Amino acid sequence: IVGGYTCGANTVPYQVSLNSGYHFCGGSLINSQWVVSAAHCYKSGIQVRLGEDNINVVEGNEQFISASKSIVHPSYNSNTLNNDIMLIKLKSAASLNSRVASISLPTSCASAGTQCLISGWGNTKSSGTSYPDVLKCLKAPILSDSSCKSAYPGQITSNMFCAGYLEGGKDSCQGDSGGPVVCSGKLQGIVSWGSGCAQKNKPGVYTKVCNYVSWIKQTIASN
Amino acid sequence: SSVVVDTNGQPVSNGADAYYLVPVSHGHAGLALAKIGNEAEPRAVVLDPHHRPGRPVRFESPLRINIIKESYFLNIKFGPSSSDSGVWDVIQQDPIGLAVKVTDTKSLLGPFKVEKEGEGYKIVYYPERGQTGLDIGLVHRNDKYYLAVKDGEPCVFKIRKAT
């Protein structure tokens, strides 16, 4: 997260880290046994870490739960970045506490200009690299689909939205992928991609979760 | 699908670090630039015996993940991360053919993938994303090995973090 702030311990309790010996993606806990993340974060033998604020130390409030099923969306297209969503069924229920809680799915899609909370442990710099120890947070508005399409010609589908600042300086970044975009208390986005980080006229692009709610509900119901 | 790995067993980073591409069959030769046609400046990417370990590269994906997988479309560049110079592309040019060259623009999604081959990795070029790839190999000319499309005959590299 570039141009953000330290979330604090209890502030983003639905944030999880996707781990295979190292942190590589974010994710969101949507109930005690299911996490949503990005399809491009798919990896064998994922461990989900929950209750973490400082990713680099064993604070004790952590829970490390192995994935039992990692289900990439069946239309995920690695050529076009479309349908960039994955569900992870955890092998056991997370125990919920002050640092571990679920985020609920939206009942409808969010509008342009709505302020959202974007979080992760990704790069905090627009040029060069610096990775934080603690979870970082950013308030960023949804951008209209027209300006998202003007920002990235030929690449924005109906299953993506832009959020952030066309001025630059504030954005998600590498290491934030798969993490939450929460608007009006509901999971509306998943960190996916962009051109650089926090660059002028190159906002973040996020998987549009409101389009997938029926797929998520069905998938959970059948698995 | 697999994570691309360096010679120390660590995942290759998305832009953050530079890496030498160390050929397994031409150990005494490193990445450099050379002139192709009637061009004034050297713009062709070559493996040069008088240039070892050679110029290091960065691998870049727009995806907000900090590692590179074999399935990601990549830009490959010399020089710094957030720059648009030293960006590899493939350009038809005599006498080399489909020659790997450097340019000063960078698309959202680059045309390359890094794919496991034998004891290291090959660079594969995609004219378009939906299609099969074309291996990058070597054209021996003027006592250097010009990187060019040579499908079936890839130059196999190990990826050594520059440090």
Swiss-Prot record, chain A:
Domain Peptidase S1: 1-221
Binding site for Ca(2+): 52, 54, 57, 62
Reaction(s) this enzyme catalyzes, per UniProt: Preferential cleavage: Arg-|-Xaa, Lys-|-Xaa
Record entry for activity regulation: Is inhibited by scorpion cyclotide trypsin inhibitor TopI1.
Subcellular location: Secreted, Extracellular space
Binding residues annotated for substrate, in chain numbering: 171-172, 174-175, 177
Keyword Calcium among record annotations: yes
Entries under SUPFAM superfamilies matching the protein: Trypsin-like serine proteases
Primary localisation category: secreted
Cofactor note: Binds 1 Ca(2+) ion per subunit.
Superkingdom, taxonomy of origin: Eukaryota
Active site (UniProt): 40, 84, 177
Record has Repeat as a keyword: no
GO molecular function, one term: serpin family protein binding
Cofactor: Ca(2+)
Tissues where the protein occurs: Synthesized in the acinar cells of the pancreas.
InterPro entries: Peptidase_S1_PA (IPR009003), Peptidase_S1_PA_chymotrypsin (IPR043504), Peptidase_S1A (IPR001314), Serine_Proteases_S1 (IPR050127), Trypsin_dom (IPR001254), TRYPSIN_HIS (IPR018114), TRYPSIN_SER (IPR033116)
Family, per entry: Belongs to the peptidase S1 family.
Quaternary structure, from the entry: Interacts with SERPINA1.
UniProt-recorded name of the protein: Serine protease 1
Protein's gene: PRSS1
